[PDB]
Design a protein around this ligand. Structure first.
Ligand SMILES: Cc1ccc(CNc2cccnc2)cc1-c1ncn(C)c1-c1ccc2c(c1)OCC(=O)N2
Length: 148
């Protein structure tokens, strides 16, 4: 009984980054969207696409994944992550708003994620699945036009 499937939108928490809007996808080289690290039933990973103008992808642990509904969760997500922080300096970083190129990318990515939430699982897959040509990770030309 998998929690997520190709197309499902999720918030991903990576260490050293804020919570990010994502979408579960099939790995272009491995062809899988979920794995078990070291065959440990607990350590399940999901291949996700990170919403934004400078796109990325990664195998994220399921324990670091929250179902995405909208940007309204972001604040409550930062509050929980700040509750289990090891220092006051860690709690400040998590509660401090995103800035610089990361902020501009996060907001642009929030636009695509919320746009995809209002679509069918196949409509959002067709619109926001990345296109890959060799080692090149490309955005869908319509998505690239909407970003810049
Ligand atoms: C998976 C991932 C891969 C690579 C890198 C390094 N990127 C990079 C690129 C060029 C120069 N310097 C650094 C980061 C990450 C990553 N890990 C966790 N998070 C939250 C990210 C991440 C951060 C920002 C964006 C993103 C993913 O995807 C879309 C986007 O527009 N912005």
């Amino acid at each position: 009984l998998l929690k997520y499937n190709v197309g499902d939108l999720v918030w991903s928490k990576v260490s050293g980054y804020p919570w990010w809007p994502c979408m579960v996808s099939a790995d272009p080289l491995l062809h899988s969207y979920t794995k078990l690290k070291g065959q440990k039933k607990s350590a399940r990973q999901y291949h996700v696409q990170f919403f934004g103008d400078a796109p990325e992808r990664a195998w994220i642990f399921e324990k670091s994944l929250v179902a995405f509904e909208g940007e309204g969760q972001f604040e409550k997500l930062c509050q929980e992550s700040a509750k289990q922080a090891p220092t006051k300096a860690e709690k400040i970083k998590l509660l401090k708003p995103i800035s610089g190129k990361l902020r501009a990318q996060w907001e642009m990515g929030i636009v695509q994620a919320e746009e995809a939430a209002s679509m069918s699982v196949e409509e959002r897959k067709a619109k926001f699945t990345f296109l890959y040509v060799g080692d090149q990770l490309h955005l869908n030309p319509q998505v690239a036009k909407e970003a810049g």
